[PDB]
Structure formats: structure tokens, C-alpha cells
Amino acid sequence: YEHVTVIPNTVGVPYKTLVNRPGYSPMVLEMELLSVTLEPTLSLDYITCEYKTVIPSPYVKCCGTAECKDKNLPDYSCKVFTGVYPFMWGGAYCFCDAENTQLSEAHVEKSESCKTEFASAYRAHTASASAKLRVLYQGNNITVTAYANGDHAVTVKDAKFIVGPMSSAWTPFDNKIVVYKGDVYNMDYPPFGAGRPGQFGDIQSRTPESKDVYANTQLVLQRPAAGTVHVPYSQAPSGFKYWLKERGASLQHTAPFGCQIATNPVRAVNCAVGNMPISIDIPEAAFTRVVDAPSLTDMSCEVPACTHSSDFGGVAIIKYAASKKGKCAVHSMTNAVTIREAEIEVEGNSQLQISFSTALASAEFRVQVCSTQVHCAAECHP
Amino acid sequence: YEHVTVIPNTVGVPYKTLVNRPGYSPMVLEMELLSVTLEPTLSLDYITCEYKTVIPSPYVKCCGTAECKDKNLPDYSCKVFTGVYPFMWGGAYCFCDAENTQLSEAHVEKSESCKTEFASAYRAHTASASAKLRVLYQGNNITVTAYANGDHAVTVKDAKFIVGPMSSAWTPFDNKIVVYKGDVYNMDYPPFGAGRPGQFGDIQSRTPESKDVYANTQLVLQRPAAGTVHVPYSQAPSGFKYWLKERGASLQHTAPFGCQIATNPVRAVNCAVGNMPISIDIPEAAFTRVVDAPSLTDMSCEVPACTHSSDFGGVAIIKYAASKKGKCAVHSMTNAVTIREAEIEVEGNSQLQISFSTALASAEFRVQVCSTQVHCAAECHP
Amino acid sequence: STKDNFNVYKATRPYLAHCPDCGEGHSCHSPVALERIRNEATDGTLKIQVSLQIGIKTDDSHDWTKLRYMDNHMPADAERAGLFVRTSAPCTITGTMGHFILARCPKGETLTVGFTDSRKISHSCTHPFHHDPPVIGREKFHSRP
Amino acid sequence: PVMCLLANTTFPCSQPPCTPCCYEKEPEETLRMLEDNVMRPGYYQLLQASLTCSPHRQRE
Amino acid sequence: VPRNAELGDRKGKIHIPFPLANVTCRVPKARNPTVTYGKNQVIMLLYPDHPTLLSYRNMGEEPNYQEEWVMHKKEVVLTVPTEGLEVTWGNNEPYKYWPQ
């Protein structure tokens, strides 16, 4: 028998569903969403990190003119400075007074930190929704993990589960995302080869293993100080270091619907948006015929204690006359009241104790124990 | 000076653009799209390949009853056959005439071929457009590789290039794609755990290294032949082998706009769709002042030979009176006519010869040599 | 020192196994029984597995001109030249080692692997196997360029 | 160091205690030992060493 | 072959010769056909030495992909649209056609 119901997409809330197969004793199933995962498909555009300005020893050509050559290196800078006369501890480095030149050269590459400290630029598209559902089935808790697309059939203890499709196709992730360790950011990052100096992407590497990198750091070599061997330069500071302090709060803190954001893989967890349809194909063996189930008569209900709150603040004592010993399903016939117990054991002229939750100050509700209904009158306090 | 123009998104077609900075001699730039790459972001759902039916030696329990146990293996099948009496070359394998049982067992796993012969199921989203552009700049050919998003600035010989955004956001790839070696297919492949027997996905492995696989091959074990040791079975043939012959023509052959399809990485190359805006920030040094150049007067144009075709089938002789010797840029002021020459040398009362291309039978066009325009009247033949 | 003489065939042996057709449609306990035919190679090459061992002698020594098969209770030596593979017509054997044969076969509906023993008696095993390898590229050619 | 198992002991896979000629000395025991290490990552190191025979009564 | 009754699920494993590997296959390229032209039309005189696959598509919005295995001497009349026509004859690189 296929039982179809719809629950709100809210994690940590147990929901009671009444399964009524004609000619078979009613069945109460408790369902609770443990987790709802929205995992987008990622396509790595590039990685970014702190850059390194590689500056070798300057070529001080004594009594001659040095020559700069075009080297295919990122942000390659070369300048030959005339009229230099550098000094070392023991005096002048060059024999000549005039006609000495200093060739200053520099290039940009990934820092040694790039393997450890880096941000990844991803193109995020069409997320696959997944759900972990706890079902109180036959007095035992069963866990069902299925894609919430309304197609993925998952069978646990002969019961076939079809979860979804989700009423909302909403995602906290935009088309372009940036990932740093355990933090995800919605960012319209610059494309590869379009990075600006002192900003996110000043250095761009397609993969973390990539030998060739893109660099735009505004590296400009300056004339060295009088009688000094050094390579002075002007450059825009690390864009990655700048982004690390300018990024703001990550998606885990800014995302609507109380989204939890996790990495490895990048996913949105427990986004409380819309509802979730549930289809359960309950097997023949799980059901008990009305004749095979106990028959209840002379039912009365008393409420000795009630508090109208979000939890089970109500207590109800139900007296009954059962035809035989057996298990009976407990269910509230009024939508404004919900019962904690799904199933209780009955035997002759005895009484049962149930826990109920309501928001009403004056709660008048019907309780169906097996196939018989009983009216409960409750005065609930704030 | 920023020069902005728009060219059709067609590869292998050289386009001439006239740069006219006020108070500076005209500049003719030849631009040709070498390649236009549309690389989508891929997210691997699973891989598929030929399956392997693992069948060990059957357990023939002589004088006893064998017992099947539930093993967590893909498509695990177990059956105990009673009343067996198998024979080997030297006679009967069992001492007992009756009460002998054969336990037949089988499971499905990835074939040895799965590392070499496999198809990958990818979720393809929001493609990044890239363009390789050849620019005839200062008598030399320069190559500019940039993302066609209208943001990625690429500087070559001090000239800043901004390519795009593309007028068409069209892609030959759907949301779900299948990749086999050098071939890509648009396929709404079954999700993981939803594969059908004898069809694409009968066996599904999340990654090629994955130990556990999904299998739905309709594996059913049969009763062995009288006095025969073997494990007969019925199973739907390889879905991957079936897909290999049923796939049809790949995207390289079926895609509109003459798309070329490549792998490693998966990309659409040279899709002739829409147009492409080009922004060139030409540096100050590249320009020559009108006074530094020559002033042209008394201009006349004669067309002694013309054929309207795809190539330069037209010949034009332009007479002029130049104030001084120097280089002048040659450009067609009519978009229906294009000139082969970008720059020619002028001197006093002389004449110049140019090659032109047109599709018009009656071509009336204006030629700008330096800062002066001349009208050309041409009767072009088929 | 013979420290590089690792020979797995000292532990393994050729065997007799069920074959549905040993010739004339009759089943037998075959010394050349077909185990598995692999056709994953797009070039059309078939990887065939049999119950006998090619290139190995009874004393475990490697000899490409020899073949070892199970003769009743004990393994016996046979010639490699006598080994044959056929579908609708004879196959081109490209490689042989132990239980494995590499063959280039014409279009067929069955696969037969056989040999001739010491007593000049022919032994063969026939299994139903649809062989019609797909075209490599866009041209259906016969010989390799 | 890659480790293999023999009854109640652990040993280096490439160095079983039966060496040299493990199979020639005890064929049943060698195969039983190999079967016990089928799931071990160093199985092929054990298979190589156990099925190699370079006896003492030999020059080379 | 039946399993040994005495021992349980006891098994060993051995490496096998001739593993499957990715290689390169050399294929012949069919001889270039005799090509004649007409108004928005291309005429090819195909002379195949063996079955050769002929495929074609328009290089516009509607490609209309068509394919046929050419067994022997066959004259093919193809319409070349303004957008262009791409023709692949066997293992040869695709031919491209455009109207004048």
C-alpha cells in the first residue's frame, strides 16, 4: 500500500502520519528530517593565494652596459640603471668611476604558502537535493537517505521510499562561488587573466599544481640608492591577504532560511525552505487486519495536566475496554493537537497515558486508539 | 585612446578597423578570431563501463544441504539446488545418490576494462567564454587570449584589450552530458542508483577508483544441467557495450553553428553564433600626429579590374597630392568593401594601388588614405 | 643465484572442465574448456581464457613451442603448432601465455578453441559467441595500414 | 615496511620464513599462507618471494 | 569445476598476461572526391574502395545532421546554405562549403 504525505522542509521536527489502508488497522508513522543537503556541481576556474616577488641578485656590470631581454615570466620587469657606483664593506665593487650599469630584474610566481593558504574560484550549477529521514517503523527507528527529486527509490525493511520533488528549487549559492578552507562566499570573481592589482585574483593559477600563473601586481622596478646594492621596487600588496580581511561574513552566517554551510564537498545543509512530499510503499506484512487487531469500547478521556506550548505540555489518561491483547496505533483526529506516542499495548479493562502538544488554551480533541475514537477535553495553561 | 568596435563571432575571417584619434593620423588594425572556446564547469556524477559477472566455483555439498547467506555485494544472487548428482571425468563427484545440493552464487562488479573503456556522466553548468584574437599591430602580429566577459583586461605591447561580453549566451551543451574518449553527448542519463538492465548505467561507479558500485543487470541463477558442474544464469547484456553502438553521432557532428567539440577539458570550439565587442586601449606612443604625417589633396579613384568574390577580386588605383613623404593608413569607409592593404608609403604627386574585396556587383565606396577620403566607383563581375 | 626465477606455474595446473560442445554438439569434460571470452578491445582483438596452459611444460619450465593440458589424472605435454582458434572460419592467433589466447577473428556466431594431443587425438571446445567487431573510425577496411 | 601474516605472527611480505624454495619444501603450507594474505596490500611481494626457487645446492 | 568441500572461502590471486590498454589505431583516409559546383549546391562523385561513412550538417541554427554509408560509386547532390555546409567523407578532415 502506497502512503503519500507532505511535510514542511524543517529539520529536527518529528511529524506523525496516519496510514489508513481500507480493511486494515490504522498505522501511525513518525517521520523526522535529520538533514537536507543541497550539493552543487563545481567546476574549478582557478585558485588564488599570496604571490611571491622573485628577485635574484642584481647584475652589476662594472665598466660596461648590461642588456635587458624579454623573458616569458609573469609580471616580468627588467631595467638597466646607468651611472651606478655601488659599495661593499671593503670599498667600491667596480674599478670604473663612471660607465657602470645595474640590471635589476624581477618576476611574480606562487608563494610557498599556496599549497596551504589558498582560495578556490568555482562555477556552481544545478544542485542535487538529498535528504536523510528518520522513520519510526514497527517500533524501530529506520534511516532513509535519498535524493529529493521524486525518482530515487530507496528500500529499507521492504518499505519503498520516494522523497520529493522539493517544492522550492532555492539555493544559497550563486553562479560563481569562492571557497576558503571551511568557508564559502558568493562572489562574482574576476575571470582568469582579468585579475586586478591589490585585489582578489592579482595572481591566478588554473590548478594548484600549475607551473605557469597569471600575474597583475603593478610591479615597477626603481633606481637603487647611491652606492647601494639592492633591488628597490613598487608593487600593490597581496590581493589574497587583502581579500582575507575584506571578505566579510561567509554564507554560513549570511544565508537565508537558516542554511548551514559545509565544505569537502561544498554543500548547503538544513535550509528551511518550502515543503517535502514523501511516498512510502508499505509492504503487506507490516499491516494487521481490523479483525486481527483488538476492538476498543467504553472509552473515556481525562486531562489531569496541560500547558499550551511548543513541546508535549499536555497529559491525557484514556480508559478503555479491549476485546483482546495487542498493539494499537495512537493518533490525534484534530490537527491543532499532536500526540507523542505512535503505538501502545492494550489489554482488557485498563487505562493508557499519552503526551500531547497544543497551542490552544481550550483544547477539544479526538484520539483514535486502534479503530475507536475518544473525545478529550483539556484546559491548557500558559 | 580607447577604440571600440564589434565583429561577428566567426573564426578565420580578417576584419579591418579604422582607428581615428582626433588630431592624429588614421590607424588601420586587422583583427582575426583564431579560436572561441566555450568551456563548461563539470561535476562528475558517476562513470560507467562494461560489467563483470563474478562467479566462483559452485559449492556442491555432497550428502548435505548448503545454505545461502545475504552478502552486501552488487546484484548478489544465491540459490541452493536440491537433487543434484554431478559427474567429473572419473565418475560421480558425490558418494550419495540423493540429498546432494549445489550452492550457486554470483555478484556484479566493474570489469578489468573499466580503467581503459569507460563513459563519464557529468553535470554541465554556466560555461566561461574565452577568445584567441590575432591583431596586426604596428606591422607585427600579436596574439590576445582573454575571457569574452567584457571584464578580463589583457595587455600586449602596452595595448589593453577587453573582449566581449558575447551577444549570444548559447551553448551546444545541455545540463547533463556524457563523455567517451574524444566524444561528448547531450544525454539525460539516469541518476546514480536508477540505472536499468541492458541500458546505459546498468553498472554505476561514482569515481573510477570506487570500491563499491551500483548494479542492476537482471542477474538470475538457473538450475545446472543433469550431472554437470557449471553455474548457468540469465542476465541482460552490457549496457555500456549497447550504448557504444546506440549512441549515434556525437556533438562534434550534430551541434548547430558549426561547433567543433574537444575533450580534456570538455569544450565547444568555434561556434559561429552572434557577435563579439572588442575594446582596445591603444597607447599614446603608437599614434603619429597628422603634421608628423602627410596631408593628402586632389584625390581620384579608378577601378580597372573587379570581380565580386570572398577574396580580394578588386583592384583600385588612387592618385594623390601629398604635402610630405611618410606612411599613410588605408581603410574602407563602406562596410560592404574591405581593403587588403593596411598601410602604404606616400610621396608628392603620385599614385597608389590597393586590393579590395566586395560581394556587390555595383560597389560605390570611400577610401580613407591618412586623413583624406576618396570615392571609388566599381563595376564588379561574377 | 636464480632469485629472478619467479614462476607462478609451479603452483598452478591445467584442468578438465565442462564444455557444452566438444564436437558434433555433444558435451564433455574438456582439457581445452572455454572459461571466458573478453571483447572490450575496440581494435577487435579477443582475449580468450581456456582450461589448459600454453607456453608451459609439465616440469613448469617455459617453452613457447609447448602446451600443457590435463590428461585424465595427470597433466601432459602437447605442441603449440597444433593449437587453433576459429569462429565461422580460422582466427589469427596474436599471442599465447598460460590460460590466455589473443586472436583476430572473422565475423561469427560461435567460438572454437582446440589442439592436438600426444596420441594425435584432436580436442576442441565450442561456445555460442556473437563476434562482429565495430568499425574503428568512419571506414570499414580489411588490412591494417 | 610492508607486513604479511602467518598463523599468530607478522613478518615482512618479501621475506617469508620458509625461504628459499617455499613451494618446493612445503607446497600445501605455502599455498595456505598465500591464501591467508590475499587481502593484504603486500600479497604480490609475498607471491613473488614464495614462488621463487634459488636453492643452497647451486653455484649461481 | 566444484569448490573444495573441506576449505571454506579460501582463495589466492595471480597476475595474468595481455592486459587491456589504451593505444593508437591507424586508419586509411578515403580518396578526395571529384567536386563540381552550382547555385547554393555542391556535387560530389564518390569512388569508395570500401564502405565509407559520409556525413553532413548546415553551419547555422538548424544543422539537420544526415549520414549514409557509401558502398560503391554514387553521385551526391547537397544544398549549401548561406550559413555554410560541413561535409565529412570517411576518415578525412571535414570539408567546408560556402556560397559566393
Residue E14 cell numbers, joined: 595471480
Separation of first and last alpha carbons in chain B? 41
A253: three-class secondary structure by DSSP = helix
Maximum separation of any 2 CA atoms in chain B, in Å: 121
Burial of A23 (0-12, 13-18, 19+ CB in 10 A): exposed
CB contact under 8 A, E57 and B93: no
CA distances for C89 relative to A8, A70, C23, C109, angstroms: 68, 67, 15, 11
For chain C, say whether D45 makes contact (Cβ under 8 Å).
Answer: no
Burial of C28 (0-12, 13-18, 19+ CB in 10 A): middle
Q: Which helix (H) or strand (E) holds B276?
A: strand B275-281
Chains in contact with A via at least 3 Cβ–Cβ pairs below 8 Å: B
Q: From chain B, which residues contact E within 8 Å (Cβ)?
A: 56-62, 86, 88, 93, 112-113, 115-117, 229, 249, 253-258, 272, 309-310, 382
Contact present, B and D (at least 3 Cβ pairs less than 8 Å)? no
A242: three-class secondary structure by DSSP = helix
CB contact under 8 A, C40 and E30: no
Chain A partners within 8 Å of B40 (Cβ) = 43
Contact at 8 Å (CB) between C43 and C31? no
Amino acid at A72: N
CA distances for B95 relative to B164, C28, C53, C72, D6, angstroms: 84, 21, 31, 20, 35
CA pair distance E44, E70, nearest whole angstrom: 12
Shortest CA distance to A123 belongs to which of A190, A188, A44, A227? Answer: A44
Contact at 8 Å (CB) between B104 and B247? no
CB contact under 8 A, B50 and C40: yes
Which residues, in sequence order, are CB contacts of B148 under 8 Å at separation 6+? B36, B129, B130, B131, B163, B164, B165, B166, B276
Q: Which of B56, B60, B253 sits opposite E65 (nearest CB)?
A: B253
Which residues, in sequence order, are CB contacts of B129 under 8 Å at separation 6+? B36, B37, B38, B147, B148, B149, B164, B166
Q: Name the DSSP letter for residue B381.
A: B
Q: Name the DSSP letter for residue A24.
A: B
Residue B127 cell numbers, joined: 560555461
Amino acid at A165: P
Give DSSP secondary structure letters for A320-368. Answer: EEESS-EEEEEEESSTTEEES-SEEEE-SEEEEEEEEEES-SEEEEEEE
Amino acid at A1: Y
Chain E partners within 8 Å of D43 (Cβ) = 13
The total number of residues shown for chain A amounts to 382
B114: three-class secondary structure by DSSP = helix
Helix H, strand E, coil C: the string for D11-50 is EECCCCCCCCCHHHHCHHHHHHHHHHCCCCCCHHHHHHHH
CB contact under 8 A, C11 and D51: yes
Contact at 8 Å (CB) between A218 and B174? no
Contact present, D and A (at least 3 Cβ pairs less than 8 Å)? no
- Which chain C residue lies closest to E54 (C-alpha atoms)? C138
Amino acid at A22: P
Shortest CA distance to B169 belongs to which of B216, B223, B219, B127? Answer: B127
Count of CB atoms situated within 10 Å of the CB of B291: 12
CA pair distance E8, A217, nearest whole angstrom: 69
Separation of first and last alpha carbons in chain C? 46
Which residues are paired to B187 by β-bridges?
none
Q: Name the DSSP letter for residue B113.
A: G
Give CA angle at A328 (A324, A334), nearest 5°. 135
CA B184, distance to chain mean position in Å, is: 9
Q: From chain C, which residues contact D within 8 Å (Cβ)?
A: 1-8, 10-11
CA pair distance A82, A224, nearest whole angstrom: 10
CA pair distance A145, A164, nearest whole angstrom: 12
Contact at 8 Å (CB) between B125 and B111? no
For chain B, say whether A194 makes contact (Cβ under 8 Å).
Answer: yes
CA pair distance B214, B193, nearest whole angstrom: 6
Residue C10 cell numbers, joined: 609451479
Shortest CA distance to C40 belongs to which of C119, C102, C85? Answer: C102
Residue B326 distance to chain E (closest CA, Å) = 38
For chain C, say whether B50 makes contact (Cβ under 8 Å).
Answer: yes
User: Contacts by A361-367 with C-beta closer than 8 Å and gap 24+?
Assistant: A361/A308, A363/A306, A363/A308, A363/A314, A363/A334, A363/A336, A363/A337, A364/A334, A365/A332, A365/A333, A365/A334, A365/A336, A365/A337, A366/A332, A366/A333, A366/A334, A367/A301, A367/A316, A367/A318, A367/A330, A367/A331, A367/A332, A367/A333, A367/A339
For chain B, say whether E18 makes contact (Cβ under 8 Å).
Answer: no
CA pair distance A203, A97, nearest whole angstrom: 41
CA distances for A188 relative to A246, C57, C58, C84, E53, angstroms: 15, 70, 72, 67, 46
Chain B partners within 8 Å of A122 (Cβ) = 41
Shortest CA distance to B50 belongs to which of B4, B119, B124, B132? Answer: B119
To the nearest 10 degrees (0 to 180), the angle between helices D43-50 and D27-36 is 170
Give CA angle at E68 (E64, E70), nearest 5°. 145
Contact at 8 Å (CB) between C51 and C17? yes
Give CA angle at B14 (B19, B263), nearest 5°. 125
Whose cell is 555432497? That residue is B62
Residue C4 distance to chain B (closest CA, Å) = 27
Whose cell is 600549475? That residue is A210
CB contact under 8 A, D31 and E14: no
Q: Is the peptide bond before B165 cis (omega within 30 degrees of 0)?
A: yes
Q: Name the DSSP letter for residue A190.
A: P
Contact at 8 Å (CB) between E22 and B115? no
Chain C partners within 8 Å of B183 (Cβ) = none
Chain E partners within 8 Å of C102 (Cβ) = 18
For chain B, say whether A151 makes contact (Cβ under 8 Å).
Answer: yes
CB contact under 8 A, B58 and E3: yes
| Cβ pairs bridging B and E (under 8 Å) | 63
Contact at 8 Å (CB) between C85 and C124? no
Contact at 8 Å (CB) between A189 and A180? no
CB contact under 8 A, B56 and E3: yes
CA pair distance A356, A290, nearest whole angstrom: 26
Contact at 8 Å (CB) between C42 and C136? yes
Helix, strand, coil percentages, rounded to 5, for chain B: 5, 50, 45
CA pair distance E47, E56, nearest whole angstrom: 17
CA dihedral A325, A329, A333, A334 (to 10 degrees): 120
CA A259, distance to chain mean position in Å, is: 7
Give DSSP secondary structure letters for C48-91. Answer: EEEEEEEEE-TTS-EEEEEEEEEETTEEEEEESTT-EEESSSB-
Contact at 8 Å (CB) between E90 and E67? no
Contact at 8 Å (CB) between A84 and A224? yes
Resolution (A): 6.8
Strands (DSSP E) contained in E39-84 are 41-46, 52-58, 66-70, 74-79
Q: Where are the alpha helices (DSSP H) in chain B?
A: 239-246, 251-254
Residue E7 distance to chain D (closest CA, Å) = 10
| Cβ pairs bridging D and E (under 8 Å) | 13
Q: Which of C95, C137, C142 sits opposite E18 (nearest CB)?
A: C95
CA distances for A374 relative to A200, A299, A344, angstroms: 67, 6, 15
CA pair distance A201, E87, nearest whole angstrom: 44
Contact at 8 Å (CB) between B40 and B301? no
Whose cell is 558435451? That residue is C27
Which residues, in sequence order, are CB contacts of C139 under 8 Å at separation 6+? E27, E28, E29, E30, E50, E51, E52, E53, E90, E91
